[PDB]
């Protein structure tokens, strides 16, 4: 095959439409179960709150995996990490109900101390093999200037575990105990700076904010002076791109493009 095609532009198009069968018109259409992976309690809400509701409404079962416990996120000398993490499990539960979310896996790695290792991959893979989701959502680990290791690591570990979920020699005790390999249908990266599919959340904006604000520990009135406009600015950045007021941007690519693809950046 492909001995025929004449330009690169030509082969690239044929590969996308015909070989890979991939398009960006309604990438989430047929998902009946998806998992949203967040580094810290509040990240799903913030990165894709509107889309989670949208999917919630269409009847999609939306599941969280939360990588860390949020231990470090207070400036109050009187709040111990253990208590803040107690507080933040409730904030998250409360936030996910607003968004239609009923299941949350807590891995309970400590905030700022999320390892990048096989051990974590095995955590993610166990849950992916158990639940068999059609879709996985995670942070874009390639986001420029992203300076939180827990965020970078969560992106990389998400993509990797999605891929290694199909591989029966990866974490082989799972297979030995009933958990078969699983091939996730797609991946979508939020908190991305090269979105390629964008979702209209203009009519969910206000709900999204309410779901974000239920993380009270994290957004006091003084923090909210800064963050509400930040959040609106981000949502506008994404919206302006499909000509609407508030958007949530995602990056989706054929599985193949995640590996040895010198033209992954064209889509």
């Amino acid at each position: 095959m492909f001995e025929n095609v004449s330009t690169f532009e030509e082969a690239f198009n044929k590969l996308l439409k015909e070989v890979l069968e991939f398009n960006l018109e309604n990438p989430f259409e047929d998902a009946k179960k998806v998992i949203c992976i967040e580094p810290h309690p509040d990240d799903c809400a913030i990165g894709m709150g509107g889309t989670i509701k949208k999917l919630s409404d269409e009847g999609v079962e939306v599941i969280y995996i939360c990588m860390t416990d949020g231990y470090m996120g207070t400036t109050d000398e009187k709040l111990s990490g253990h208590e803040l993490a107690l507080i933040r499990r409730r904030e998250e539960e409360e936030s996910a109900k607003l968004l239609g979310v009923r299941k949350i896996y807590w891995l309970n790695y400590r905030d700022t101390e999320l390892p990048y290792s096989r051990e974590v991959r095995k955590d993610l893979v166990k849950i992916i093999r158990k639940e068999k989701p059609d879709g996985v959502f995670a942070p874009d680990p390639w986001l420029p200037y992203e300076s939180h290791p827990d965020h970078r690591r969560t992106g990389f570990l998400a993509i990797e575990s999605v891929a290694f979920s199909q591989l029966p020699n990866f974490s082989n005790i799972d297979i030995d105990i009933g958990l078969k390999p699983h091939s996730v249908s797609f991946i979508a990266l939020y908190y991305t700076h090269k979105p390629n599919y964008i979702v209209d959340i203009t009519d969910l904006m206000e709900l999204k904010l309410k779901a974000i604000r239920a993380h009270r520990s994290q957004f006091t009135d003084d923090i909210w002076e800064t963050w509400e406009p930040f959040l609106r600015t981000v949502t506008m950045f994404y919206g302006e791109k499909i000509g609407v007021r508030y958007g949530e941007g995602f990056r989706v690519m054929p599985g193949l493009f995640y590996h040895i693809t010198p033209f992954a950046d064209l889509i």
Copy 2:
């Protein structure tokens, strides 16, 4: 807030001007103490020495933290790394003297073995909590084609530790022994390929090249024949941008932009 603005561009401008209060006019003016982080003995001077002189002239206290010991930087099969490190400590003390630098914290990690971990984070956090600096300076860890692990790691660990210095649950024994949280005012990344603030160093250029030359173990006469050109070529690169002879570039962003900010790259 920001419910009344039509465009992303106006939200962007509003965010930086009204909500953040961020300009590139004289980012360093209010500085009475700064810490300049370098991976190896000689990096403050090579990337930032001109600017260090200038800040010193104003009576801004300049404290160095040096990550490693330089143990590896020689091709001489009869120099042992121990001897090399001893030397480069003296060489750095000279250089530092020329620039009005009178405090060096040596972390003593071995050259090419600087770790990326919480441990080294606590070192930087301990030293930030005690000197309470206004500014910290560090390499840009996203510098393209940067192949030295010590350089990437210091850039990241430097940015993270500025953030984590503010958190009392992080490295919580510091609090316990009377070192309290500290908020740093600015981070300026040097060795950057996306500077947004330039400093004129045309006059002080020769005192920079002598601060550098004092690293005699590194800059032998033969090797000054490759490096002098290279060093002047880098100073022009930054210079051209504000129309002077010799410049040193820095990237400075609001702290918010180091996290989840997909248009971080527009400043």
Copy 3:
């Protein structure tokens, strides 16, 4: 020196041709012996197998280092990783014979578990010092969207060990046993999205393909329907850049550009 030059652009042009005597015309010119470092069995052949016959042909001796054993690359519940690794070693001997490669170093780190550590650098440096190669080939670790850690790590470890191979205090027991430091002449990165030297492989394409196809375990008929077009599309992407139908890309820079070079993107 370089006190006479008037613009950055001039200094840059002068630094390149006069100081570093750097050209893209033929970099693989004087190569007597070269090392191709691959992350898995099959990468040398997929990324640069055309250039590898083109190198053999001119009597350049080509040596593989394979970082991993490729233990995880199958969806077949039948095949244990141990058996796969075996099958794959055979496939790699067949693939290399076809391309005229008569030496392969197997590090045997397990697939998906290749460490990023000093210990792996010592392996590469041991091989490097021993074979004293003029040329080293390795994956671009900065290929965007590259999601295999083993790939990223192979690229970074390769460049760092080329550099560290020159340092006597580095892995100092190699010296005390009769391996002297060694300076490689060039590094070329393959699997790159920013090549700056292309090799015409139009005549050899069916050869590269057959050698790729020799890794049967990886390329079944049903997978070949996707990968053949992918493969052809990649070489087309490289061709168009120099006018021919099929090419293989490489990026090559002056040694100096791998460190603190804010203008390294300009080649």
Copy 4:
């Protein structure tokens, strides 16, 4: 011995009488392929005949156990896997979980605890057997680590906050009834294996890669000598020995050496 005797008989209710009798499912942990056969083949066989389900966990692949330069470690691990399957068949074992850590590189870490605990919660065994990590002069890291990790994992399998995703996917806590340590120099229960010794040796010889005729010249003496060491202690010819203690004597018990 006024307080000691009473704690042991009226609070923890423990004895060296017949501790295995209650069992239905036991797990036998070996560092490498052959260690169960070597360390407790006689008892495995016994238990198997008496109706007990015996499952193996092998920590490593045995990748390193050859002096032949022509044999790659991947081949050897394949070989050694068919040797253990052959060896275990002889002894009536039917499931072997393979961890596949590389021989010589068994980590000592939470991650390995999590494999052990996942299987223990899965299999709900009454008993677990493991090497005594206190065997004086034991110089193999894989051996010491297997012992420690086995004991730790047994203790943590019961704790809902340890490896908590197991819970969330339906593998509940489990409480093993006893731990038995083989390859121990301080045994407090011996098992008669004179009836079963040639079979043991045959289950042992099934690891052909390991026991050539040349090596067997050195090891059949070694192994006959070991099982006399234990058997003598109860005045029979051939025994395999075990250390069993009540769960509590593995923690802050300064008198644990008196049993």
Copy 5:
């Protein structure tokens, strides 16, 4: 010493004249001591007896707790974070009863205490800060001890005590004004090799309460197993020096913690 007869003579002269080592009341001169425990409740269980007796005699007693106790529950409905908050509360109530008013909390998670330079720097930081006279810890060589946190605490405590004296160890401490400190003595509790016992039958009852303040750790149902276990543990030590209830420690010349092949003779 190039003059003594048998090794037996030289031994006693080394103890007696060079190191001036004796066990009559090694705790006699102590103004400030650190007690290091792997998990909250360990100081109490193993040595609350002595802790009371020392707050009394004017000793400022400082706890270091290595972990947070996150794991020590069988209740499926208690999250690890809740447990830790509770045990922190329980420990403050147990510290109160014993005359302790300062606990450093390292906060490494239960079952995940690292054996590393990093943890050493944390002990060394607190030791250089408080310049204490003696440190207490678990004996890391306690036979059959199966809990990694307990062993590691014993090993790291002794190492950090020795490394505290070294200015090139964690040099940044010095650089910011935490200077080297030499501890005067170490004493290991939770030991099967005690060489000094403390009489605590006067306080055994207070001790038992200070332990019970760890409600999460001790149901009424579980106290059925554990109090007789503690009573039996207190006898082993109690008999050795004459009395009904005892607390054992092992104490050595500092020299004995290195390359000392006769160490078990004391």
Copy 6:
């Protein structure tokens, strides 16, 4: 082997006839040995007497030094890089005295010796290169030994000796001309379980001189404690074969380093 009656008979026949193991003179056939030390001075202190004896007799003696001694000082004005420069010179002197031809410096930082495969690869690489007949290292089971570097040195040493024969172990050595090697004996010094003692009564004075050559460790002051200690150490070993000054070693047949429940009987 079915012909035996008691374990004791079994044990003696395995020892004399199967293993060919005796301790009458374990070092007699040595043409080259490696002595592995955690820090500079440990070879001298532990077995310097026996090293002299071995050099005198024509045996090529090699050191491997695990670490650089960077931490060993109280002087808040002496940096660790300096100390290591200084300590290496101090080692070169010491060695000259015992007739030691050669030192490998591994240069891991004092107090930071890793316990990992990486360090085994270092030792395996020097063992395969030198093909020594005997390897000496500290006994890692020395009771109360509290220095991580000494424990880890002993363990890595024994393990690397065994792994040195395994061609799949550190496989790039084989591919570069470094074949496996099978060492003849291991001897453990700093042991509390010697089974062979060398009489060093004669060479005792030169040993304290080879030791004092490490000026940085052994000021006159500290020496007022250490001459006694060292003399007491040599007597403990001496007074077991009834001589004045001894150096002790533990030697066991290779087989006893693995799954051997009666190993403490030899």
